[PDB]
Amino acid sequence: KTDQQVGAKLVQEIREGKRGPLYAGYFRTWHDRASTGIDGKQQHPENTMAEVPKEVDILFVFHDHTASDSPFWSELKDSYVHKLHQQGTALVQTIGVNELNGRTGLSKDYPDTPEGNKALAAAIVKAFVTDRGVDGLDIAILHEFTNKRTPEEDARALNVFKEIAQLIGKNGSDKSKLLIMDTTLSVENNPIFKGIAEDLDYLLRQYYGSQGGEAEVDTINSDWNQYQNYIDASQFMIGFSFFEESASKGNLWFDVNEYDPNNPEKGKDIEGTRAKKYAEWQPSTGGLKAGIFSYAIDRDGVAHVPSTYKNRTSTNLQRHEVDNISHTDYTVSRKLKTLMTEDKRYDVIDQKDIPDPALREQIIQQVGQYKGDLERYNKTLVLTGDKIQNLKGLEKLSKLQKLELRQLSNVKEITPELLPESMKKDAELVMVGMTGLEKLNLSGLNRQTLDGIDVNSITHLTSFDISHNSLDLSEKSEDRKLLMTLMEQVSNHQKITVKNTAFENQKPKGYYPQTYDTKEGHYDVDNAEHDILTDFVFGTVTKRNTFIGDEEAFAIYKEGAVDGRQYVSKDYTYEAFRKDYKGYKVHLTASNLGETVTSKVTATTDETYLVDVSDGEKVVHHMKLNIGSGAIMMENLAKGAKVIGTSGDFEQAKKIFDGEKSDRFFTWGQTNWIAFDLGEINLAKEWRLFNAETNTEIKTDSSLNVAKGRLQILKDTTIDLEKMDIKNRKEYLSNDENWTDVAQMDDAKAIFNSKLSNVLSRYWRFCVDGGASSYYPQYTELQILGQR
Amino acid sequence: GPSVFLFPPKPKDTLMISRTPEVTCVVVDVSHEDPEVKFNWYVDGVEVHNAKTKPREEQYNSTYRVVSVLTVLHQDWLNGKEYKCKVSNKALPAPIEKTISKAKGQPREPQVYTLPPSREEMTKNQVSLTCLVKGFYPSDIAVEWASNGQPENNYKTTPPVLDSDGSFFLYSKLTVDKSRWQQGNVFSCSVMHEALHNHYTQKSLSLS
Amino acid sequence: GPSVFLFPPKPKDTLMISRTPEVTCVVVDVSHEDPEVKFNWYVDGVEVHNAKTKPREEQNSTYRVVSVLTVLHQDWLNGKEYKCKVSNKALPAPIEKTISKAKGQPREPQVYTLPPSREEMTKNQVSLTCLVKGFYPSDIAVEWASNGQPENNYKTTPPVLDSDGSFFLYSKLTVDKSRWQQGNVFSCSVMHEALHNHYTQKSLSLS
Ligand SMILES: *[C@@H]1O[C@H](CO[C@@H]2O[C@@H](C)[C@@H](O)[C@@H](O)[C@@H]2O)[C@@H](O[C@@H]2O[C@H](CO)[C@@H](O[C@@H]3O[C@H](CO[C@H]4O[C@H](CO)[C@@H](O)[C@H](O)[C@@H]4O[C@@H]4O[C@H](CO)[C@@H](O)[C@H](O)[C@H]4NC(C)=O)[C@@H](O)[C@H](O[C@H]4O[C@H](CO)[C@@H](O)[C@H](O)[C@@H]4O[C@@H]4O[C@H](CO)[C@@H](O)[C@H](O)[C@H]4NC(C)=O)[C@@H]3O)[C@H](O)[C@H]2NC(C)=O)[C@H](O)[C@H]1NC(C)=O
Ligand SMILES: [Ca+2]
């Protein structure tokens, strides 16, 4: 009929995926012969959009440089669209995101309000779709390096986009129009994508240049891993770029072959090109992709500028033969389209895959229409209705994450050879209303649970085999209760035999218990080694949390039986079931507040430890451990102590009492002192110095350690430094005659701990007597350890 | 091809015990194609492995930057030890080697003088507290302002200027509301330089 | 290959009627082999033919070539662009360098003279200080004088961008303490396009 009534049939058959894999191309408006610049002069006569061939399913109108009053726009509307529609090519207008977000265009003419953004959306559809005579709209949402878009801008863009989705697209008033987003942002940094994905026909991801890894597609596979949650693979399209003329560093991608001086036609060869790679590339998961697209299709066939020009720039410009403009045959585009349509994966699902026509129909509607979808589909399949006789071909859905069998009344048999390999790796299996099913064989599928099988609706059951699975059928298990129902169902039709109720040879998998009981462990002072893991943090559980402490408990578990029929596999070793507790570490804080990492403790003396057990990534258990009568937990009495004097920087001295090891104190010398005030008199039993190398911020060499020092207390037990003048206080604390040593340091240890003779003192001083080298010594923390 | 730039530590960081000085090494214009950039650091020709390489930073399309930051010991820097940064890459013919050390020459102690506002400036809502530092060498120096123990932050300092005697001088200009000046608050001009005792002096400035 | 540097006029020369301002264009590292260096001068993209090229100067086997264009005070102060274009055989393409005066609302400098610090008075030479602040653009000239005669033992800081978008600097005249204490008057002369007749003077004597 009309240019609009023909275009509606293109869009419909494109949307329903009847074209096979798609090829698309961004035509640069300023390379059409009808295009004119601001001075009303022609820019390039060599090429036109009308010559784009039928192998291009979608041609994107990509606008810049073409002046807005150019005759081009009439030619596009009145001439090109008609010509292109005759072969079955759709036109789509590409606009930038800044058209929506307020930065440019009609968005600066409408307020950022619910009603304003709606009216803008409608203005955009008219301006860029209706008036231009094209078949859809493509919004380009790219990565900004410099003037990144404000959250307020992106939020507006999305709101405007969602309003456009009401007017055009799969979910719009007008469904004769495609709605597309192209982007260069990953899902994690693409909030607009997340919001509009449900309304998109296609996402076009530009992947020009290498994308990392040996096969240069790392970023594509990683991105798809996220994209797949929001769109189907049938909506996903990856793009390469042709060589643009006079392109400098920043726009040199090498997606097509380089110039060859002996083969003018090398640019038209697609062999060993990223273009061919993208045509060939498919997602691991979800299904086959929609297709590929090219940037600057008007440059189809032109060889890339040689690698030697890789770093040419706008100023430092080294031009080349290939920077000249040329007519194109679209040779590369047609080769890439033919390649994809000749790919065997896009062959349709036939009776050789799924025999049953009723099942074939439903699988096609849910997973896709191509052979290569079956391999990849990794979501849910819901099979329904009384037309399905047999489930042959369902095994091809290797990655299926869930299978729901709902009211399949003419299905009489379920065998393990019918179900997909994903069932052996914990895919979900639901079946409800299986009124015709008489035989349920789920043997050898490593089923860890019987969840999903609505046993009450399986009313015509006569036999079942759930043997060679990974079930826990112990007394207090849900799975045993489900088995009991399966047997009661069978017993309604015939006496329960071994020939119709197989449930033996279970190899239930082992897991770490979620919580351990011991919150307060105890040992005698037996002068023996004990192991905290074997004694207190031990054991394995099933999927149903059945605890097996040791080999002996596993033996009792194996002896378990239903109707005197042992259900566990006899050939199943404890070594297999048990967890090995590999890489479990035990962190021990003593009463000393000294830390060690060991599961061993030799019970020589009275002690108490706090025990934090780590699997390797997280703490799985805390408890206390008293050796003998125990010891009372000391505290760092020096924590937050007031500095009252020092030979160095006063503010820096305060970092010895902050409780971190993220900063150090030193002076321009090998000697220094810091005097400090614990605020009250308390019983000091030990002290601890964390030396220079304990620094947790800068990797500090031990040559910066304190080699020799002295901890001291003030002589005058009851002197009021309170009431002393600042000037006198300094002279007083500086004078060595007022201080008695209480501890000595003679070793450049990373951590130095020694005991004190039950020292009662408010005021303390620590002198550094020398370093481990000529480098001025540092230390990070000082503890005075005892009871309050 | 990739270039290399080697920046010295901030003079305050070399002189102040509270701070950790860093030599920084920047590699610009790294290609997407061959992205691996290995750094080797030397201190008087002795390899050190304590450096810390930050991950690449796309500057523009398909072109990255890579920074490596080596912590330095105050003494090593001030004793004028050479810091060599060596960069390797596939898109380099040979590795690139850049070296920096401290400015050599007989140190001269800065003289710090604080100057009050001009009578003529007192007609304005904000007045200019001035600090003159003169006769110092080398030109590595740091100037800060303070008042009542809190940092004053609305100031600007001139670059060092070579005086006629071969030493350097500069001016720092703290701007304060006239109210605060007239009320008789004390302001401090802190100067940090290698030729000062503890690399530090403070001069005060209040209304007479 | 050859490099090009284009220097603006001395700010006093643009501001004073007695003086003739000049834009100067220097080409360094010219080879002995291909020595011909052609200059073209443009004022707002309009070629001017009144330039004056000085002959080569061995700065080995490498020459330097300077070309000096006289400018009209008004043209400079109205912010006209001066383009210098250099040609050479050992250049792939000609080199084009441009300078103009910084565009922006001019702002009048405030000149304050500051006497020595009490603490400096213990020394045989003391520092007379002149603060110039709040001026735009940064083109400025500072001189000292006393009893009508120029004082010449001074140094001035480069302009520094202040937090309000204007510039400031300090000039520091050094005098024997004797001359300061004897009560001589010193003058700080400031020359800038935003001053009346591009000139003011502030005095400084013992108080
Ligand atoms: C960075 O790369 C990405 C692609 O890579 C992707 O991201 C990277 C990080 C990796 O992850 C990749 O794997 C991944 O694939 C670029 O994105 C696409 O890339 C191509 C080029 O590779 C771009 O083509 C260029 O487009 C400009 C015009 O671009 C419009 O659209 C942009 C985004 O929408 C927007 O940023 C632009 O500003 C511009 O937008 C428009 O603005 C005008 C008003 O200014 C408005 O009227 C329009 O409506 C509006 N259009 C919109 C919004 O779509 C184009 O100019 C470029 O071509 C010039 O340069 C070529 C040589 O490099 C040359 O051959 C061309 O002829 C042309 O040059 C000029 O010709 C004219 C006329 O003869 C002449 O007057 C000029 O003097 C002359 N100028 C110069 C200097 O050469 C080029 O085609 C796509 O825009 C972009 N998006 C899509 C959807 O394809 C990204 O652009 C790259 N960034 C940079 C800075 O290059
Ligand atoms: Ca600390």
Author numbering:
A (entry chain D): 45 to 832
B (entry chain A): 237 to 444
C (entry chain B): 237 to 295, 297 to 444
Q: What did the publication describing this PDB structure actually write?
A:
The IgG-specific endoglycosidases EndoS and EndoS2 from Streptococcus pyogenes can remove conserved N-linked glycans present on the Fc region of host antibodies to inhibit Fc-mediated effector functions. Streptococcal Endoglycosidase S (EndoS) and Endoglycosidase S2 (EndoS2) enzymes remove N-linked glycans from IgG at N297 within the Fc Cγ2 domain that are conserved across all IgG subtypes. The glycosyl hydrolases EndoS and EndoS2 cleave the β1−4 glycosidic linkage between the first two N-acetylglucosamine (GlcNAc) saccharide residues to shed the main portion of the glycan, leaving a single GlcNAc variably modified with α1−6 fucose. EndoS and EndoS2 are multi-domain enzymes, comprised of a catalytic glycosyl hydrolase (GH) domain, a leucine-rich repeat (LRR) domain, a hybrid immunoglobulin fold (hIg) domain, and the so-called carbohydrate-binding module (CBM); EndoS additionally has N- and C-terminal 3-helix bundles.
The crystal structure of inactive EndoS2 (containing D184A/E186L substitutions to abolish catalytic activity) in complex with IgG1 Fc substrate was determined by X-ray crystallography to a resolution of 3.0 Å. E382A substitutions were introduced into the Fc to discourage crystallization of the Fc only, as previously utilized  (55). As also observed in the earlier EndoS-Fc complex, two EndoS2 enzymes are bound to a single Fc homodimer. However, upon binding to the Fc, EndoS2 undergoes a domain rearrangement, with the relative orientation of GH, LRR, and hIg domains changing. The structural comparison of bound and free enzymes demonstrates that the arrangement of the four domains is not rigid, and in particular, shows that the GH, LRR, and hIg domains have some freedom to reorient relative to each other, allowing EndoS2 to sample a number of conformations. The EndoS2-Fc structure reveals how W712 binds within a hydrophobic pocket at the Fc Cγ2–Cγ3 interface, formed by I253, H310, L314, N434, and H435. While the basis for Fc recognition by EndoS2 was previously unclear, the structural data presented here now reveals the different orientations of EndoS2 towards the substrate compared with EndoS, providing evidence for distinct modes of substrate recognition by these two enzymes.
